[PDB]
């Protein structure tokens, strides 16, 4: 899809190591602003904490998940993020990355 990030869970706090141009357009950030940061900076006042906890659980267990949650652009504008997370493993079965795809959400 057009909007995604790749994170490296083998580095402290699972930082974004790549952000697609679509993601940067969606969120209003630049590469320099967000590479090396955990994606949680997108959350804000109206983000449902139970949903965030369930994302944490999915990441802990390194499984695919799809959730919808409120995120914020750099200028503070809310959007509904239909987030799909996909673990990426090497040939030996070891986790290498997560891919997170931001789709158009609702509600
Ligand atoms: C590849 C990937 C992409 C993510 N994308 C988003 C995102 O777009 N929006 C968001 O609110 N959280 C996103 N997250 C989730 C946060 O990085 C974090 O896992 C979540 O806030 C739960 O962890 P925490 O309780 O430490 O914050 C993403 C996580 C991964 C691994």
UniProtKB/Swiss-Prot annotation:
Changing residue 102 to K: Blue-shifted light absorption (maximum at 441 nm) and emitted fluorescence (487 nm). Red-shifted light emitted fluorescence (502 nm) but normal absorption (maximum at 447 nm). Expressed in leaves, stems and flowers, and to a lower extent in roots. Present in guard cells (at protein level). Autophosphorylated in response to blue light irradiation. 2 molecules of FMN bind covalently to cysteines after exposure to blue light and are reversed in the dark. It is found in: Cell membrane. The modification S-4a-FMN cysteine is found at residue 39. Induction: Light fluence rate-dependent induction, independent of light quality. The flavoproteins improved LOV (iLOVs) are fluorescent flavoproteins engineered from PHOT2 by improving its photostability and brighteness, and which maybe used as oxygen-independent fluorescent reporters with a small size. The iLOVs are PHOT2 fragments (385-496) and contain many amino-acid substitutions relative to cv. Columbia, to confer different properties in term of stablity, brightness and color. Residues 1-62 form the PAS domain. FMN 2 binds at residues 38, 40, 43, 56, 71, 81, 83, 102. Residues 63-107 form the PAC domain. The activation loop within the kinase domain is the target of phosphorylation. The PAS (PER-ARNT-SIM) domains are required for the binding of FMN chromophores. Homodimer. Interacts with PKS1, PKS2, RPT3 and PHOT1. Associates with CBC1 and CBC2. Binds to BHP. Undergoes a photocycle characterized by fluorescence and absorption changes induced by blue light. Half-time of photoproduct formation is 11 seconds and 15 seconds for dark regeneration. Protein kinase that acts as a blue light photoreceptor in a signal-transduction pathway for photo-induced movements. Triggers the phosphorylation of AHA1 and AHA2 C-terminal penultimate Thr in guard cells to activate them and induce stomatal opening in response to blue light (BL). Also phosphorylates BLUS1, a kinase involved in stomatal opening. Mediates calcium spiking of extra- and intracellular origins in response to blue light. Involved in hypocotyl phototropism. Belongs to the protein kinase superfamily. AGC Ser/Thr protein kinase family. This is Phototropin-2. The lineage of its organism: Eukaryota, Viridiplantae, Streptophyta, Embryophyta, Tracheophyta. The gene is PHOT2. The chain holds residues 388 to 494 of 915 of the full protein.
């Amino acid at each position: 899809e057009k909007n995604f990030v790749i994170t490296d869970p083998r580095l402290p706090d699972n930082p974004i190591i790549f952000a697609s141009d679509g993601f940067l357009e969606l969120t209003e950030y630049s590469r320099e602003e967000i590479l090396g940061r955990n994606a949680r900076f997108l959350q804000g006042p109206e983000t449902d904490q139970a949903t965030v906890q369930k994302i944490r659980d999915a990441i802990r267990d390194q499984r695919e998940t799809t959730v919808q949650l409120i995120n914020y652009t750099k200028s503070g504008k809310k959007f509904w993020n239909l987030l799909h997370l996909q673990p990426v493993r090497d040939q030996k079965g070891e986790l290498q990355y997560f891919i997170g795809v931001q789709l158009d959400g609702s509600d």
